[PDB]
Amino acid sequence: AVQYFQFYGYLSQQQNMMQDYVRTGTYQRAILQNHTDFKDKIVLDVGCGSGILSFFAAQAGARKIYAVEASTMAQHAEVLVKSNNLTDRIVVIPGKVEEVSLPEQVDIIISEPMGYMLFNERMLESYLHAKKYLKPSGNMFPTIGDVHLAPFTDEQLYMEQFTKANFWYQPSFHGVDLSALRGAAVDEYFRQPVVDTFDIRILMAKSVKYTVNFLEAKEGDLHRIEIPFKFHMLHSGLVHGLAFWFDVAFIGSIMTVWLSTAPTEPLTHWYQVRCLFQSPLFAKAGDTLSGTCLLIANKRQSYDISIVAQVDQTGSKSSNLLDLKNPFFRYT
Amino acid sequence: AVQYFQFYGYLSQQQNMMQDYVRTGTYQRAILQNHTDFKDKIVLDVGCGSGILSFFAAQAGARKIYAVEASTMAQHAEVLVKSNNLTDRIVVIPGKVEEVSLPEQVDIIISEPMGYMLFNERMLESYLHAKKYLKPSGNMFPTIGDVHLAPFTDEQLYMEQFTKANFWYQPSFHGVDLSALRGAAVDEYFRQPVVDTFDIRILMAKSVKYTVNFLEAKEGDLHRIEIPFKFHMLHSGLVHGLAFWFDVAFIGSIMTVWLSTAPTEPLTHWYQVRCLFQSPLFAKAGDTLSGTCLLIANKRQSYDISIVAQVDQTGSKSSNLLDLKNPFFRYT
Ligand SMILES: NCCCN(CCNC(=O)NCc1ccccc1)C[C@H]1O[C@@H](n2cnc3c(N)ncnc32)[C@H](O)[C@@H]1O
Ligand SMILES: NCCCN(CCNC(=O)NCc1ccccc1)C[C@H]1O[C@@H](n2cnc3c(N)ncnc32)[C@H](O)[C@@H]1O
Ligand code: NA
Ligand code: NA
Q1: Could you tell me if residue A134 is inside a domain?
Q2: Fewest CB atoms within 10 A around its CB: which of A48, A152, B277, B317?
Q3: Residue B175 contacts residue B244 (beta carbons within 8 Å)
């Protein structure tokens, strides 16, 4: 938790995030296209970072914005509030949203709590916790999250896991036989979710969607996420694993604005995530690939990912158990 | 500590380290050129990782090697011991060297406990702690460590710190004036030690040396390290900061073998480290640059670095306080 809050305390990290043009532009459009939803309202910005969303709320004419930030980035937000002449309208509160006092309830909660595969962020539970401050009528921005799963074919990604483990084949590394660890090295590589982008031509079926309604979801809902799937295969070939991405919708009174991390959309700093099966499955177009993706919260502000899949027409099955704490950042 | 031991638990990390050819080749030469110092002896390998140093001790004819490893890498070391037919001669002990039981005292301790700038590794104190197991006559490999400091001139590195902060000059970033944070952003960049290599032509004086004798040093000695310097300037120009590197010597009965991370030597995964002054100092050839580098252990298994320097002939002075927990990895 010291490491988590140290990470977010750096202006270099805020700069890196603010340079995702899709992320910045989409949040600004969501808030300002729905300006009637903010004008003269009370706003809570959960994990405000440098404060940009609180400035967007102010741009839309919000009367009072409580900007809550647990890292030392709170001191930098406070400098921008003063320098942009908004000490009347933005109140920066240093601390955890679970531990601070707000002097009143709010019309709307705004946040950017999304991790890789949507869920990989201790902030999303904190976002749902913040609803204790929301008036009964109140809204959340974002309002819903859709996680998308689709089967992919990519023998280059599959074969890379073996190639990276080739080091361990050496029978005389400075007189040591390393070969007994080659299997363990391959296994370790297979248990890392792969963060990068890819051509949509690797996707073999239309995605399945798991929707979280942030207006309705409770903190505890995110501890165990079970996503059944049945894919109608549109392509014939080896299925190497599942690809993951997410959309969030800001459901305003004037319009719904989408932030999509789909591989059909401009690239974001979320990229996409791929989880290999331990062994690939042959599917023909018209086959069904059925199974379950289970995300179980672990104590590392991350998730164990269990995937089981079978081709219904053959009974051929595979699985994997991955740790989203140790992702492989493959993007170059 | 969970993060530290998770990091070292990965075969991918052991592979990365084992592919530093200078590191592997130098440890093998040190041990095998001094084979008479290992033959029929009892050895302790502190933080053995995959076990390579224990295999090198075995190559030199050691009778019994206790290989102590606190991470899950201990299970992988045990697989190599079995597969290389050395269960008679190498005993893998899972746990911290501070907490485990050895059944006997040892002739020699071998380890690779060196971090950036030598000291940046919770293992070096653990290496000195291990001496509780060393026979009075006993040796340590490595035996001594030399940290080298030298003044450097590099206006490209200096100007980069301002260039990276340029983002924050924006008077209308999506309608927000970021400029009040530009100073803070520059300051943050200046407080990161820079890990990369450089041409020796940037060094303006012969290095000063701080020596740690691992045979004599106590655990507590490493909490506060004070390095006074007086440089005899050999070049005229702006001094932008201090450059750091280190050598360790394996002082065997047959020969002394050096592992050097100097910028005059083949590159290692330690590279070199540079700490900027907040403001550069003009020195002419023949001037003296005097001051102190103070390393104070912090609770992040790292060090605060305080540097003060003055050109004696002008009185012009500068300083910085850096955090070795947040280094900038600039090498490309
Ligand atoms: N992708 C996940 C990025 C998540 N960040 C959000 C950073 N906010 C941000 O960039 N806003 C501006 C923006 C600009 C453009 C578009 C969108 C937003 C998390 C932020 O919350 C902080 N935190 C975590 N847990 C808690 C807690 N319990 N209470 C209070 N603060 C907490 C944490 O220190 C950090 O500053
Ligand atoms: N540069 C710093 C790299 C430091 N590593 C050393 C890894 N050893 C290694 O590569 N040896 C093989 C080798 C090959 C070629 C040349 C040289 C060596 C630290 C290793 O000690 C482990 N650890 C840390 N603190 C403790 C402790 N208290 N007790 C026991 N184990 C502890 C930690 O998990 C990790 O496995
Ligand atoms: Na292919
Ligand atoms: Na120059």
Answers
A1: no
A2: B317
A3: no
